[PDB]
Amino acid sequence: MPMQMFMQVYDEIQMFLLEELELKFDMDPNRVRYLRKMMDTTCLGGKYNRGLTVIDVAESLLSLSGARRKRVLHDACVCGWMIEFLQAHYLVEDDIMDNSPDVTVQCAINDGLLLKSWTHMMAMHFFADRPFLQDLLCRFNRVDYTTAVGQLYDVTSMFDSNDFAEFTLSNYKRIVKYKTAYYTYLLPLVMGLIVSEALPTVDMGVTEELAMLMGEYFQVQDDVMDCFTPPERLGKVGTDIQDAKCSWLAVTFLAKASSAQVAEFKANYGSGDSEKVATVRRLYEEADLQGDYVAYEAAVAEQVKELIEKLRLCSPGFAASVETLWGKT
């Protein structure tokens, strides 16, 4: 029912956007079918955890505060696809960075602009008569701005914006917070509370604190899998060492490494050579970072498993969905 309804609204959203282009933007059929294929390619195929989270929050709040149920459930599906389209927009922007008049790059940039604008068009249409339309766009635009700021922190974590000084645990948390946590964990929860009209009925401080901790828990495991999980099992090629990313493994190693090991780390980090990357993996393994990885995640999980209770003392139905979201993480 949740996944099935989420896909039916996708067809409804896609049909409106494409017909709007045909009826109001003078678009020819060839380009409409071209944009249908691009939308399906970029927006479909993932796990839809961000979009389904908006649905799961909405169904938990209508059970504990007829005609309003079906409306809120439909509004949550549109908000779910706003985040999915936003995620597709971020992924397209990432492809342009590593892929390199070249018409394929021109279309890639155009795709990224259309996916972002489509979040506005589908919101301005299906929420035209909603009282929360203005507040929804402001929180959506602010979180999107937050993500772009977090991408600046992540991209420039190894240089001086006109370098391992910013390779600290507090700065790692800043990167995870702005680049990932706000739009992946906090935004689906907020949009689920907005369509359920129960936004001022929750402790936002505890909610934000959980979103950052869940994103932190997810990112620490992600950095670890990027380094040791093989490509055919991870689904991609791990490249954090070659890209000199400010990963959890790097900032944790630098805190417990000897003075001579840091020299060996700095001399091998950020290189595409197969053995310098293997040297970094060897340093991570010998420093017993795997033992700290289990302890760090357990402590974060303890903070998560205990922070949901503060949220249920004032909003019980909200906490049920955060546990399901944490169960996915």
Added chain:
Amino acid sequence: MPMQMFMQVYDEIQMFLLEELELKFDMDPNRVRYLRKMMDTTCLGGKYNRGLTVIDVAESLLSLSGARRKRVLHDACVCGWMIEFLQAHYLVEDDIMDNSPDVTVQCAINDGLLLKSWTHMMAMHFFADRPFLQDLLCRFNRVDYTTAVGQLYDVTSMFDSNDFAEFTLSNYKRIVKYKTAYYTYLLPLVMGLIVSEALPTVDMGVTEELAMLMGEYFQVQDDVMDCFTPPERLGKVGTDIQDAKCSWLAVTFLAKASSAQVAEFKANYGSGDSEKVATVRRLYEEADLQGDYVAYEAAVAEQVKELIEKLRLCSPGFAASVETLWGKT
């Protein structure tokens, strides 16, 4: 006074955006100064015709409908910088297309996202208590979506989105309309009417018709200068022939060219070779396209000089600014 006030509000807008990053987004001073330089580099230096148009429309409507004058004039300056920042966003996106982990491309993409988001942040702040905040964002987002659709029409005018069939005058007008006319001419006028609270007091059909005709007049002259004005006088290197653009010269030539000249045109168009481009210029010159250029622009100017009168019979102060805008074109 207009240009001087427009620059004072820029300092006010820039100071808010940068302090917000410092105070609310945990940004370090090094990146704040980095973003100050990027903002100045991308948003300053142009002619500010889009931004000043919002000011000129606002001052003409407060003279023919104390505390409300200074507020509307300030609101028009913020709306003027929204379009300038939006224009800077489009230009950055254009640089990424022709410029080619590469950190300079990562920062270019990040710059384009920040410039766009900054239009939302400066609007959500200075217009927080304005009743038109929701309507302003919707018309702004829709025009931005329109521009991205027009860029699709322009980029794919020579191929079949998975070719000279689309090299027609009606499709040329569609490209100019969506890619340029809506955000360069219509949007500054609409935003000037919104801050002056006189949006429903104008004939939008005549206003839209003037924006398309003025953008058409501007683009026809632009395509002509791109082909024959030398680089040191044009300010850039004309590349429409090499890029196989759907320019006014191309669609006009194909209508009055002989069957054998079209073969010579198709065999030389869209090539970087110095003589194939000179062959295209020779074909444009021999076809007497310069004589049609003066006649076409005169006819458009006649349509412009006569359409402003329909607008003044119902909105006299609005027509005074459209003439000043047309005087710039």
